Structure formats: structure tokens, C-alpha cells
Design a protein around this ligand. Structure first.
Ligand SMILES: *[C@@H]1O[C@H](CO[C@@H]2O[C@H](CO)[C@@H](O)[C@H](O)[C@@H]2O)[C@@H](O[C@@H]2O[C@H](CO)[C@@H](O)[C@H](O)[C@H]2NC(C)=O)[C@H](O)[C@H]1NC(C)=O
Ligand SMILES: [Ca+2]
Length: 178
């Protein structure tokens, strides 16, 4: 709601970084990711979850040519799902919702027709030993500029945790709680 923690990222970019305590690093067969955003950027990474060093697994929510999508890897090759029909960089508030079940995924913006992707043949299922949630894209040189609100990832309200000064959150660069 109104109480959902909201952060503004400026033109110079910033990062909010959640690092799981070592023993708390999760492994999942399915994920759920959602965030409210407003932006005019043609390109930027909003959120990326990475596994521990040496493991290639990741899950990345990003905008490319004004269109929002998720690319992820759970141990085979990059799997992508995208809202290709309509751009989201119109400077209006949207909600993007993503689910993953093994190699399968869904993606919806607002109330638009749902995108679904079901890779064929033998697949892996586990997103192994997740180590960090990077928000804002600055670390990968694709900074997000705009507003992020009410980020939800697998039960974690990460922006709420940032706003509450969670000891496993680091914030730097051009980012501000509103
Ligand atoms: C990932 O998704 C596959 C395929 O999903 C099935 O096919 C269509 C996709 O076009 C989808 O709309 C249906 O809902 C259906 O689930 C899953 O594989 C299927 O699993 C179901 C339920 O266990 C079986 O009835 C089907 O035989 C089976 N089909 C195939 C082609 O294998 C798969 O389980 C799923 N992966 C995970 C981890 O959930
Ligand atoms: Ca894996």
C-alpha cells in the first residue's frame, strides 16, 4: 500500500544490496518476484539475484529497448521471458509480476495478457544457493533510473527491509527512501 517502501534512483545510479547470511542462502524450485516501478529509461536492470561465487545461477529483471523482461539461468542456458507487445518506460506506475517453476516462467505487467514460457525437453529445476539481491542495476553498468516500490521476492519485502535498516542491506550511490 501507501506504506510499501519506495526508493528513487537518480541519473547517476545506485544500488540496494541484500546479502543473505551464509546459512540462510536459499535454494528454490520455484520463485515469485514482483515490483512496482515508474521509469522512462530505455535500458536498465531493476533487480538481479545471484548465486554464491562459482555457481552461475541468476535471475534478472530488466528493461531493454523500453520493454520489461526476466532472464534467468538455473544451470543450463539463459532462459528469457519478455513483455514484447507494449513498452513500460512511459513514466507511469506499473506493476510487474514474475513466477518461475523450474525452467518454466510467467510474466505479467499490470492486468495485461500474461506471458508464459515452457521450455521443451529435459530441464533442471533448482535455483541453487542464492547469495545476494542487487537492486538498481548499477553494479552491472545498466543503471535503473526511476522509482521502485514494494519489491517482493520469495517472501522478502526487500525495500521494506532496507527502510527498516536490516543489517544485511547495503545502500550506496544515488538512491533515496521516499
Ligand atoms: C514446466 O511445464 C511443463 C509443461 O507444462 C504442461 O504443458 C503446457 C505448456 O504448453 C502447460 O500449459 C500445462 O499447464 C502443462 O503443465 C511441465 O510438464 C508437464 O507436467 C504436467 C503436470 O505434472 C504433466 O501432466 C505433463 O505430462 C507434463 N508435460 C510435459 C511436456 O512434460 C513441467 O512439469 C513444468 N516444470 C515444473 C518444474 O513445474
Ligand atoms: Ca542449479
Amino acid at each position: 500500500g501507501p506504506g510499501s517502501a519506495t526508493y528513487i534512483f537518480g541519473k547517476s545510479g545506485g544500488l540496494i544490496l541484500y546479502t543473505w547470511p551464509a546459512n540462510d542462502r536459499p535454494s528454490t524450485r520455484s520463485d515469485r518476484l514482483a515490483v512496482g516501478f515508474s521509469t522512462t529509461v530505455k535500458d536498465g536492470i531493476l533487480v538481479r539475484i545471484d548465486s554464491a561465487p562459482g555457481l552461475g545461477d541468476f535471475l534478472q529483471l530488466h528493461i531493454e529497448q523500453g520493454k520489461i523482461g526476466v532472464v534467468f539461468n538455473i544451470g543450463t542456458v539463459d532462459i528469457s521471458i519478455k513483455e514484447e507487445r507494449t513498452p513500460v518506460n512511459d513514466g507511469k506506475y506499473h506493476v510487474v509480476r514474475f513466477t518461475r517453476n523450474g525452467a518454466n516462467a510467467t510474466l505479467q505487467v499490470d492486468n495485461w495478457p500474461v506471458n508464459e514460457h515452457y521450455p521443451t525437453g529435459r530441464q533442471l529445476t533448482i535455483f541453487n544457493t542464492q547469495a545476494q539481491i542487487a537492486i538498481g542495476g548499477k553494479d552491472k553498468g545498466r543503471l535503473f533510473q526511476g522509482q521502485l516500490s514494494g519489491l517482493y521476492y520469495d517472501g522478502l519485502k526487500v525495500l521494506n527491509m532496507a527502510a527498516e535498516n536490516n543489517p544485511n542491506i547495503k545502500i550506496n550511490g544515488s538512491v533515496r527512501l521516499v
